[PDB]
A paper describes a structure:
We addressed this issue by solving the crystal structures of IMPα2ΔIBB in complex with FITC‐labeled peptides encompassing MCPyV [name] NLSm (274‐PFSRKRKFGGS‐284) and [name] (300‐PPKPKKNRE‐308), to resolutions of 2.30 and 2.55 Å, respectively. The MCPyV [name] [name] peptide could be visualized exclusively within the IMPα2ΔIBB major binding site, with the minor site remaining empty. The P0–P6 positions were occupied by the same aas bound in the bipartite MCPyV [name] NLS crystal structure, however, only residues P300 to E308 could be built into the electron density. An additional hydrogen bond between the P3 site K305 residue and IMPα2ΔIBB N228 was also observed.
In the best characterized pathway, importin (IMP) α bridges cargoes bearing basic, classical nuclear localization signals (cNLSs) to IMPβ1, which mediates transport through the nuclear pore complex. IMPα recognizes three types of cNLSs via two binding sites: the major binding site accommodates monopartite cNLSs, the minor binding site recognizes atypical cNLSs, while bipartite cNLSs simultaneously interact with both major and minor sites. We combined bioinformatic, biochemical, functional, and structural approaches to study this phenomenon, using polyomaviruses (PyVs) large tumor antigens (LTAs) as a model. We addressed this possibility by x‐ray crystallography, and solved the structures of putative bipartite cNLS peptides of MWPyV, STLPyV, WUPyV, KIPyV, and MCPyV LTAs bound to IMPα2ΔIBB.
Residue numbers in the entry:
A (entry chain B): 300 to 308
B (entry chain A): 72 to 496
Write the structure that this text describes.
Amino acid sequence: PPKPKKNRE
Amino acid sequence: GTVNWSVEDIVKGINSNNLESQLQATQAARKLLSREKQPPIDNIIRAGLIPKFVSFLGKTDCSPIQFESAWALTNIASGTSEQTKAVVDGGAIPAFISLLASPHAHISEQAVWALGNIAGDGSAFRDLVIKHGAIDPLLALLAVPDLSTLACGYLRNLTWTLSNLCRNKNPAPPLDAVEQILPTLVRLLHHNDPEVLADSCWAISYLTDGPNERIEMVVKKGVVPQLVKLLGATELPIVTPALRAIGNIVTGTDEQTQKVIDAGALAVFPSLLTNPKTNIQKEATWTMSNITAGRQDQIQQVVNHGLVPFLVGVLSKADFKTQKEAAWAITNYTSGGTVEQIVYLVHCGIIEPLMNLLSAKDTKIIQVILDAISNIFQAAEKLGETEKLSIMIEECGGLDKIEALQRHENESVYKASLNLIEKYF
């Protein structure tokens, strides 16, 4: 399952 | 120039009355939140900077500060539920929704990303993003004749955000929102980018996890054939979500299960049930258990595709969780199958592995196996061959296990084992 939240690095 | 700033310097810059100083301080904050091994989200929040970033989102004449504040807020909203709540409490949802219409694609993409995080927190923030009216603009961003004309990263972020608007199930997404999003999801399900395909299949798997009416929505859109096709994919990132969706669909009515069978899904299961990945095998065996719990013609289609030998194989050598799902499949098959089908099951070699699994330390698998036994024995009595089956269960070393189960903690276990030991042995 894809990550619910994502940081933009 | 804005690299490795202090939070105090960022505050001094943002609290100045100089838009350019504020822009440089916001870029400094973004870089601090986008690079530090452990970004200082909590200190940024404590400094009271979220309302200022939210206000900068609305500065149409300074697109750079819009972009930098959107990025910083995206990274704050990507953390704990409390940090995402901090972003929401600043009024960021309506601001990002307004920003979705920006003439600048990087800013629109960053808004899509931020909303994706916010909705990814959970059902409440998802429903709040929907109430603020995000679905219409988000889908407008994909209202193009050919998705291939859009940038790969743009489309990927849009797809992931939409998949988050379909995610979580207590409560489940609003039905009107699902009806409004599904057509675009089908269109994305027919796109060639593997990340778009994976995220869209995950969205479908979200929407199929629940009551049969939701499954009916998805199946009415006519996506099952494409889901089977993707089940045949070479990329596990695509096969895993597709298999989840298919299993969810077969948890529904026998007619939805029949839609899956008609699309040709069973032909893929020889690979899935021998797949090197344990998760694919376990979920394929769970799907098989929900198919063998269907009608006798569907059990017959399982038999015709040659999948009973593969179930015997999984029951013989596999991870214990996959083996338990296989035991479930067998008990459903025996509970709903004809005598011919149960005889075929025995002829394929089910008895010895089923026995060997009665040496396990899980009460439920023991109950499931013993019920499968009772069913096979009941089918034997219709043919007067119960003695043959008893001898077979004795030659594999199973009577010893059932006899030891005569003295088992759980009541159902020893009652079933005694009924078998006395009625048939």
